[PDB]
Design a binder for this molecule. Structure first.
Ligand code: UPJ
Ligand code: UPJ
Lengths: 304, 304
């Protein structure tokens, strides 16, 4: 028992982190096979970032300008191309530690682990969620750009995120591994405000199931609700509307605990309308929304 | 910017996890050099655990009874000995992936990362603290025993914890790597209740500094306090008494932010006496105490 915010083991991704330098700028790169992926803003100067024309700035760069270092050994760059907002630096050596991998584009509500790196060196690992406004609440300093978000399915790493920007409100923006930003964010230093940060309703319900499974049951009540009734309450509190897909996705947890999804919705409805009353659920004083139903199932069963 | 509960990169420790089986029981073992460390309760049957005489149960076991498997390759056991509550299985092969390491016994308030494993396979990584009552709030299922807690100082892993028990209240107990349990817990299925779970005051103050550094400043007030006055309030709310050592330990953070430690104590005093008033600090609705001043400094600067 016990339920914790748990990141995937980072070993497989640590073996992929390299340091990329272009001029005065040093950020991280992901080394898979003979390609190093990194944010294209590595070629910008602090002046360029205000309004950069990346195709133009890239014409001024050659293979030898991209300094790629894996630990203390330098990698030879034999090609360079821009794919959307990432650079793909072809190296002469395939990464011997390349795990089995996929590049996936996740949806908001989906969670992943971030291996925070600086100078191609990993510093820590934490669990994030792609927020419904396509931002992530990360922990990234200068030098952390190029750090990746991933999920692991047994031995295959599904890379979903690469860090690019910090919005002036402290939230983070980045791309999938094809260089397409999540949401409307651009790799430009401009006025990009994040939209409403809605709460991931299905994730809160999943975490309520995790709590019942681990002994925290005080919030269970004698009520039920409907999807439409619950949604009126979810609307009021800036929660994602609950769909029959989310109800179906919650099925395995409903089955295991014996609590119908709509009854758990009525518990969540009461928690929204009345607060926690100074109580906690899984050691938290607010409704946690960065555990998916799959994360709850994984942790509650011990998937490796 | 952004502050997250961050675990150390788990790569170095993943390469040490092995599966240990003794009879019907399968748990995890730590493979460093030619020794595999595992909880001594691996030799118990569910009947034995009520009142086990480990020296007696161990006489019935030989080197060939300890089945040690690293991935799909079996390790030959050439020796076995009991050190306090852990078994040390000498193998014929030194772990090629043995990182630089230390075995350290941490104090309560100190934090570490747990690589949760099942059948010698890592499932996830999360950050814990050794609670002042010598328990940890982990996430461990059956099969997770033998999972370790660690800290990393550049390339040296300091192993501090090995999982052994789950108390009937959902909290966890284990040993350092010399087999000595933290606190008064024993590897016996008996009535072991955890003591008062006091809040790690110095860690809360450190996390308040992390919050100011990242933009959350609403809780800052026009008050100050003394160590003795603050301690009257800390006593009332089951907080650890603040010492001049903790004030000194907070020095670097006080210096960086310009907020005197005692002024931050007065902010913490007001938060204790008045609550958060439905507000949050670093995305949390309660006072976080599992970030040490060193963790705040590390994350706020990007130590790899
Ligand atoms: C996220 C990251 O690693 N980086 C973005 C900020 C950047 C930096 O420190 N400065 C000042 C800069 C350089 C070039 C272009 C814009 C801003 C380091 C890399
Ligand atoms: C923590 C851990 O991995 N283990 C302790 C519980 C144990 C188990 O499932 N049972 C039923 C058991 C076996 C032997 C002795 C006591 C309890 C699996 C290992």
């Amino acid at each position: 028992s016990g339920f914790r915010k748990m990141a995937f083991p980072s070993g497989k991704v640590e073996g992929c982190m390299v340091q990329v330098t272009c001029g005065t700028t040093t950020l991280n790169g992901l080394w898979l096979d003979d390609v190093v992926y990194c944010p294209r803003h590595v070629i910008c100067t602090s002046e360029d970032m205000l309004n950069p024309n990346y195709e133009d700035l890239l014409i001024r760069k050659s293979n030898h300008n991209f300094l790629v270092q894996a630990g203390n050994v330098q990698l030879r760059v034999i090609g360079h191309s821009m794919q959307n907002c990432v650079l793909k630096l072809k190296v002469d050596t395939a990464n011997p530690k390349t795990p089995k991998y996929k590049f996936v584009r996740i949806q908001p509500g989906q969670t992943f682990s971030v291996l925070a790196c600086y100078n191609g060196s990993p510093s820590g690992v934490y669990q994030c969620a792609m927020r419904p406004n396509f931002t992530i609440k990360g922990s990234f300093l200068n030098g952390s750009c190029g750090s990746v978000g991933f999920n692991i399915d047994y031995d295959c790493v599904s890379f979903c995120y690469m860090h690019h920007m910090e919005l002036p409100t402290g939230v983070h923006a980045g791309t999938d591994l094809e260089g397409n930003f999540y949401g409307p964010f651009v790799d430009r230093q401009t006025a990009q405000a994040a939209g409403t940060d809605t709460t991931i309703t299905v994730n809160v319900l999943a975490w309520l199931y995790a709590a019942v499974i681990n002994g925290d049951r005080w919030f269970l009540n004698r009520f039920t609700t409907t999807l439409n009734d619950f949604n009126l309450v979810a609307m009021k509190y800036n929660y994602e509307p609950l769909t029959q897909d989310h109800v179906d996705i919650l099925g395995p947890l409903s089955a295991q605990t014996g609590i119908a999804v709509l009854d758990m919705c009525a518990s969540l409805k009461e928690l929204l309308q009345n607060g926690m009353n100074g109580r906690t659920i899984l050691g938290s004083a607010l409704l946690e929304d960065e555990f998916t139903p799959f994360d709850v199932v994984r942790q509650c069963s011990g998937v490796t």
